[PDB]
Amino acid sequence: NLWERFCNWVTSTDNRLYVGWFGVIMIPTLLAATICFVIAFIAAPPVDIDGIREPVSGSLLYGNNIITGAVVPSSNAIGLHFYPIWEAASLDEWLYNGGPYQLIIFHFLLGASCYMGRQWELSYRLGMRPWICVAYSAPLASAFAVFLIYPIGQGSFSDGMPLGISGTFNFMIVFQAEHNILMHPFHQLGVAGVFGGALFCAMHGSLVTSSLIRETTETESANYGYKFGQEEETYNIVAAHGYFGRLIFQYASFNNSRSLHFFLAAWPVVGVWFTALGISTMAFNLNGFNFNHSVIDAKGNVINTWADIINRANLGMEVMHERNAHNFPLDLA
Amino acid sequence: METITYVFIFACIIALFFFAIFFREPPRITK
Amino acid sequence: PFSDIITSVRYWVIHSITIPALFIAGWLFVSTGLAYDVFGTPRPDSYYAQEQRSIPLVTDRFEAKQQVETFLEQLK
Amino acid sequence: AELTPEVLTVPLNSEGKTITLTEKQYLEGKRLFQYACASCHVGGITKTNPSLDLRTETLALATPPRDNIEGLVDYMKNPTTYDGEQEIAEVHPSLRSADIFPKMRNLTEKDLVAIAGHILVEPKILGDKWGGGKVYY
Amino acid sequence: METLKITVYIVVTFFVLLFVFGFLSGDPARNPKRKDLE
Amino acid sequence: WAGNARLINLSGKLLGAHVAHAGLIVFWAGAMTLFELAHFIPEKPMYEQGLILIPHIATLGWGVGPGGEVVDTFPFFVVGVVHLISSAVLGFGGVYHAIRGPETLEEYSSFFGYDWKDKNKMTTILGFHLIVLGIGALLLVAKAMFFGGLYDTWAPGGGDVRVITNPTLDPRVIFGYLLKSPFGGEGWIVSVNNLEDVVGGHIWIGLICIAGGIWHILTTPFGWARRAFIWSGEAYLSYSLGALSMMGFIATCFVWFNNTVYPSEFYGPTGPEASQAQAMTFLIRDQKLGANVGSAQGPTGLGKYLMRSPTGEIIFGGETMRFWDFRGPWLEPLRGPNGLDLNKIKNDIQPWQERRAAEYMTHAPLGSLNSVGGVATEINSVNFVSPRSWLATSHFVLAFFFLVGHLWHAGRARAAAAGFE
Amino acid sequence: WFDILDDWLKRDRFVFVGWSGILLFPCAYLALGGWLTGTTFVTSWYTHGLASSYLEGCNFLTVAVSTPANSMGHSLLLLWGPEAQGDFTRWCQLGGLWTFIALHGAFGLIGFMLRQFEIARLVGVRPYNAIAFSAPIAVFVSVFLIYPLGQSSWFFAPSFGVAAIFRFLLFFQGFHNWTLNPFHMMGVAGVLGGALLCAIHGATVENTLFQDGEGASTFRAFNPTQAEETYSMVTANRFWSQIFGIAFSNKRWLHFFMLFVPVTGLWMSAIGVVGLALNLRSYDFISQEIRAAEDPEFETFYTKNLLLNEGIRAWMAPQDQPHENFVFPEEVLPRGNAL
Amino acid sequence: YPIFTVRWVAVHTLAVPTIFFLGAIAAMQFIQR
Numbered sequence A: 001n002l003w004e005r006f007c008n009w010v011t012s013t014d015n016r017l018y019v020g021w022f023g024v025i026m027i028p029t030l031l032a033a034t035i036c037f038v039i040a041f042i043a044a045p046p047v048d049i050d051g052i053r054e055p056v057s058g059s060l061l062y063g064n065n066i067i068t069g070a071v072v073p074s075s076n077a078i079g080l081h082f083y084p085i086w087e088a089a090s091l092d093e094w095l096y097n098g099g100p101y102q103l104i105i106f107h108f109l110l111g112a113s114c115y116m117g118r119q120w121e122l123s124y125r126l127g128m129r130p131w132i133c134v135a136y137s138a139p140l141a142s143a144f145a146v147f148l149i150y151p152i153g154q155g156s157f158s159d160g161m162p163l164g165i166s167g168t169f170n171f172m173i174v175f176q177a178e179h180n181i182l183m184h185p186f187h188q189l190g191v192a193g194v195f196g197g198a199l200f201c202a203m204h205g206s207l208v209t210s211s212l213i214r215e216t217t218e219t220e221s222a223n224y225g226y227k228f229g230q231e232e233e234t235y236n237i238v239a240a241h242g243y244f245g246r247l248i249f250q251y252a253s254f255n256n257s258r259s260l261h262f263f264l265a266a267w268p269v270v271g272v273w274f275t276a277l278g279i280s281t282m283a284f285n286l287n288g289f290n291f292n293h294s295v296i297d298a299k300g301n302v303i304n305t306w307a308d309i310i311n312r313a314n315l316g317m318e319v320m321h322e323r324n325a326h327n328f329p330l331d332l333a
Numbered sequence B: 001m002e003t004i005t006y007v008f009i010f011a012c013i014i015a016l017f018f019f020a021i022f023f024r025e026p027p028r029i030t031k
Numbered sequence C: 001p002f003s004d005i006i007t008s009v010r011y012w013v014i015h016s017i018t019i020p021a022l023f024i025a026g027w028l029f030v031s032t033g034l035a036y037d038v039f040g041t042p043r044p045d046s047y048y049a050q051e052q053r054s055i056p057l058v059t060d061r062f063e064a065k066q067q068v069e070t071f072l073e074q075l076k
Numbered sequence D: 001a002e003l004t005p006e007v008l009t010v011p012l013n014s015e016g017k018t019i020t021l022t023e024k025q026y027l028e029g030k031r032l033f034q035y036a037c038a039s040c041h042v043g044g045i046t047k048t049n050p051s052l053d054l055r056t057e058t059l060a061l062a063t064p065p066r067d068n069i070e071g072l073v074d075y076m077k078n079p080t081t082y083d084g085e086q087e088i089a090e091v092h093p094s095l096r097s098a099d100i101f102p103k104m105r106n107l108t109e110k111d112l113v114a115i116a117g118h119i120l121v122e123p124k125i126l127g128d129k130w131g132g133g134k135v136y137y
Numbered sequence E: 001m002e003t004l005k006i007t008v009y010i011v012v013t014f015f016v017l018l019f020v021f022g023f024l025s026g027d028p029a030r031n032p033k034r035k036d037l038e
Numbered sequence F: 001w002a003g004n005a006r007l008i009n010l011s012g013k014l015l016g017a018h019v020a021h022a023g024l025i026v027f028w029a030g031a032m033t034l035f036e037l038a039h040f041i042p043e044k045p046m047y048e049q050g051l052i053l054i055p056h057i058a059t060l061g062w063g064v065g066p067g068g069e070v071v072d073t074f075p076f077f078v079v080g081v082v083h084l085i086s087s088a089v090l091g092f093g094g095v096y097h098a099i100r101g102p103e104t105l106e107e108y109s110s111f112f113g114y115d116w117k118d119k120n121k122m123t124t125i126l127g128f129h130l131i132v133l134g135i136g137a138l139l140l141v142a143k144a145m146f147f148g149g150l151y152d153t154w155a156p157g158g159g160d161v162r163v164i165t166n167p168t169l170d171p172r173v174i175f176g177y178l179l180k181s182p183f184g185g186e187g188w189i190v191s192v193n194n195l196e197d198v199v200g201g202h203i204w205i206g207l208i209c210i211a212g213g214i215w216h217i218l219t220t221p222f223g224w225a226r227r228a229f230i231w232s233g234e235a236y237l238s239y240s241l242g243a244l245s246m247m248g249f250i251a252t253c254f255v256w257f258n259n260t261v262y263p264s265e266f267y268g269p270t271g272p273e274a275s276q277a278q279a280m281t282f283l284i285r286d287q288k289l290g291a292n293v294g295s296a297q298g299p300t301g302l303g304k305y306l307m308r309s310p311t312g313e314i315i316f317g318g319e320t321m322r323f324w325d326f327r328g329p330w331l332e333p334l335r336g337p338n339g340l341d342l343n344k345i346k347n348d349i350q351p352w353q354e355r356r357a358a359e360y361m362t363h364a365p366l367g368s369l370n371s372v373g374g375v376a377t378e379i380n381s382v383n384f385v386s387p388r389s390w391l392a393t394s395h396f397v398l399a400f401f402f403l404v405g406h407l408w409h410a411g412r413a414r415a416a417a418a419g420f421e
Numbered sequence G: 001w002f003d004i005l006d007d008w009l010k011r012d013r014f015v016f017v018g019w020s021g022i023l024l025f026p027c028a029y030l031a032l033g034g035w036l037t038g039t040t041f042v043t044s045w046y047t048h049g050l051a052s053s054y055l056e057g058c059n060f061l062t063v064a065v066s067t068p069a070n071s072m073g074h075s076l077l078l079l080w081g082p083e084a085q086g087d088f089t090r091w092c093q094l095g096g097l098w099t100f101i102a103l104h105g106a107f108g109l110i111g112f113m114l115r116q117f118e119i120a121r122l123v124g125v126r127p128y129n130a131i132a133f134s135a136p137i138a139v140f141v142s143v144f145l146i147y148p149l150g151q152s153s154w155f156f157a158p159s160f161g162v163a164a165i166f167r168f169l170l171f172f173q174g175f176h177n178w179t180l181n182p183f184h185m186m187g188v189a190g191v192l193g194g195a196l197l198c199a200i201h202g203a204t205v206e207n208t209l210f211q212d213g214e215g216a217s218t219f220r221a222f223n224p225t226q227a228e229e230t231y232s233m234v235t236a237n238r239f240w241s242q243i244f245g246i247a248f249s250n251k252r253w254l255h256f257f258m259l260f261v262p263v264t265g266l267w268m269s270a271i272g273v274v275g276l277a278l279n280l281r282s283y284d285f286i287s288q289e290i291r292a293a294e295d296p297e298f299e300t301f302y303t304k305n306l307l308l309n310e311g312i313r314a315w316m317a318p319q320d321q322p323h324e325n326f327v328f329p330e331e332v333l334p335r336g337n338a339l
Numbered sequence H: 001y002p003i004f005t006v007r008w009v010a011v012h013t014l015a016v017p018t019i020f021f022l023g024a025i026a027a028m029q030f031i032q033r
Ligand code: CLA
Pocket: A187, A188, A189, A191, A192, A193, A195, A196, A199, A251, A252, A253, A254, G140, G143, G158, G162, G165, G168, G169
């Protein structure tokens, strides 16, 4: 009998949120991550990323400012293994081998995953379509790609992606010096998806703003809104479709509102869809292009193509990434 | 102290959350 | 364009003979070698003067022209 | 600035006689190098033993001498430690070790010669680079 | 710490049975806003 | 142009389509097998060219000697042809059933082939296809025990095709693999070391498939099952859809970390193989320069070559410390209690071991779209890309999109039940 | 004779050629041809040392139009420029193209915002779009003019190509640690925020569309009288409110805010660059550096990065900057052990 | 209907050069050394 009274609670509106079966995991999970994570950033002790005995400490108390960094990746020794708290000894240990990293990550992904489920489930209790579930799927998938797949493809969570601002940058740099991304279509479409969204989110909102109902209670001293009850909605779509059409050409402009908003959710999502793949594909070593040589068979004199000066920089960095943690000549992972 | 200041400005950004999400002005159809 | 000349035969007729006439006209632009001399884009024969391990650079703002020539006389 | 005869006028034996290769050959040299070498000898640098290269100068100091073709040919058939005291056939490609380096099974005298030629003409073209990878390092 | 490991698993599975048994649930099942088929 | 969605209910046309795309899958099987034995050159590392099925065919130890490319050429031509013709045998079928006429009104037919929303008939159709897998699975078993063996990469010498005897049929062992941590080296399905486990692990499936195929045949789903699941046609795709995704992942990761199943000899060396291979390659090199491996002290104080693993054994040091879980036929003989024996190392190390290290270490799975071999910085004079990176890469991709599919079609089954249709 | 032209010219045809139509098309055409021409036919190794076009065989990516030589400073070397002396072929050899493209192309951008103003006073719409467009124009001048001006010459300006741009990126990372600049950070904020909006807005709509609006149940219809439009704000609101926690529901704000994020961002980013033009950067944290030198057992990601940079700089500057003629002996180069 | 600035010029101004290049480029792909 009780069991029935509980479910009804979870299922409908609670005057704050909606916490369905999906948030039954999402809420306790994302909490453990938050708390742990906030504290790790304010006091975590140094952590030696690559097994080496050279601890890096990117926490507030240990001499950092916000940009300087945060929660550092597990050791390269525990690298790919499961490192819970119970599994170790003293926390002085745990804290050194990157525990916080794993703990925070895994809870976050799981609850991150469920935050997505929750999005759909709310749709089922409100009779609306299931799309928002899909558009979130892009970044989520990406987080996983960066936080999981790679360390899974590489052989150790260490060098997953630090939880600091600064290290984000590091991960990036090291990354293209090791796999050369810039020249990979999936990260190229990525810049397309993003620079896309920028150009469109500006375009739409720009036009939507220019073709407004010029005459609705808007004077030069006041500006007050609309509300669903408002039939004609805010703008004269004929003015916008007319505007844009006259700036380039008829086809160029969009006739109806579906093709407009569908585009807005299509471009970005399918751009990151790919990028998130990009990484996941270079997680197992299928690195970007690399046109290192173009010649003059005349003598075979090598001619440097713009791309070689790209390899000249990619080079300097390879050489010094993870200084003194290499004992053999060629990195293989 | 370089610290408390990054913390201080932190607690506010969370205090602002609570207050924004739980004490916001109503979105009503009374219109 | 709803397909306007896109359907008629005149459009194909006047281009079937026009477009493949530029397609070729261009091709011969490269086979003949005008590109190189009109644009001055050295050919594999002329990058390095056999055993001239240096890269032609440009130094003087006013002698660009006489400089460049100094480089073409060399290769010859 | 084209590929010239002199360029291909490479030393053939220790004393002083030389042979001038051709266009056809040169190219087969690469194709072969890439076939059973590059993998381990990319751009003329040992991956397995970085302190030993394939530059011309370092080959002359070998035992027996290797700045010429006959020497390389000998090496490809049967291997010789930089000093010439060990038989490294159970370790390095050798027509005598076909049974273990299948890529070698097909090879022929003509191909060794060409491969050898590729290794001696390259440096005249690439220079420092082919050595320790300058452009490459 | 072995005491900790145990405590966790209880907690975790606890909220699992609430996910699982929350769906198979004969009571709430798959009840929507537009149509209830029971 | 949801054309394929107009077909939803006219099962008479789906058969025409399902059996049309079912014809492509087999077509590819021939077009690729023949394309491969085409470009294929004998005695050159299968994987240094760019093959994928043949390696599968030699996996089943269909045509090979101790880790020797192929002694018998033919075995592949059979496969190339068969599947290429099965593509017509079905192309005919798919086309016909697609164009000559719909279904469901044939009385004797509806008795043999029913429709949707009918739990008892869907169930029955399901079990059917289950009786088929129960078989194909068991056939694999046949091909290892009473037929031309299977390729065991393990003990001894070269591990050519070998026939198995009394597969690990213990009830415990088989599901133990299911109950083990999917972390650090131990992935439930991937942990499979002994080839005999694999055989026995197939016997149980078939018995389980069949025992199930028949089960639903005779039984219609219970209440709990009825009130959890929906029954729209689109919804059964959502079930099946997401199932395949998981697996895409499954196999992908399964691909990168080899179990005897994927003998690294055809497929190439494992991401870790290369690294661990590079450590071993250099112990020897310096060992030959008289370097003492036990007292080595790398700039870190961890010894260049040897260090420990958290549980205290010996492992090659260097970043390759994260792959001490790695196990293969070459590195094992030096393995013993407490980790690697410092005494077998410098005393009992055969030459053929340096070879494998060097080869693998040399063909690192690392590659780019230009098929450039090695580090992102190398020169374009070396072509290679470990099959594994190809399988892992492409297949990951599909397992992802496909999941996007589990979301799209399953969320649309919520719109049929009452939402938007 | 005037007004007539006004009309003939401003006549509503397929492709609107307004008063601005005169700047826009001659410039935006030549700026395109200029690229495509050199891209396919010119070499820039007399001026840069690398391969510029297809004529030498670069892939699309590799091919580009390279910047003039550093020896020339900011002399706009136009065809009749005292330096080219009217000889076209050389005017190209020297890179006189870059200047071409940037100048004509600068005006095409001028024309395009002008054409955006015209159309708004003919149709009677708001000028807003024309204003949103300033961001890119800022970014452009910021980048291709201001920056090269502040520095040694035209050479250092981005190069007109694909890879030639990636190289730009990296260049910045090494000598400027542009990633640490806060301005690029905000810029990085709006661009990613533009795409975040573009998804939620577009998905929310599409998914909150009115039920049964189409019996067939696909969604390819509308009309003018369809005043109410195809979806609910009331449901979205509650959707968000209960999932994310917040949701200002007032369509007019939603769209404007969508102007603020992207555009507000690029202006910063452009500011950030006017700064680097003067080698004025955010490349250092005195506080850290100090304790970084008095103590060797202390390291943060801040530091690890500064190391990569020097690697970028040492290895990449002698081939990348031919004019100073850097000679760097193997030993000298910074280098981690074993690599 | 007639020939006009808009329709007419626009198209050939962009569209004609293209095939000249595509023609030139097509020629490139076969060149040696
Ligand atoms: C100022 C000129 C300029 C130009 C023209 C480009 C152009 C480009 N850049 Mg570069 N860039 C520039 C400056 C420039 N950049 C600067 C200053 C920097 C900083 C140093 C960069 C940094 C940069 C990076 C880091 C990257 C690029 C990339 C790209 C490519 C991106 C493709 C894309 O999706 O874009 C976004 C735009 C869109 C998605 C839409 C453009 C509009 C199209 C053409 C409309 C098509 C519509 C059709 C005609 C009509 C249909 C009608 C409809 C009704 C049906 C593109 C070729 C990326 C790449 O992939 O490189 C190869 C990449 O990764 N750029």
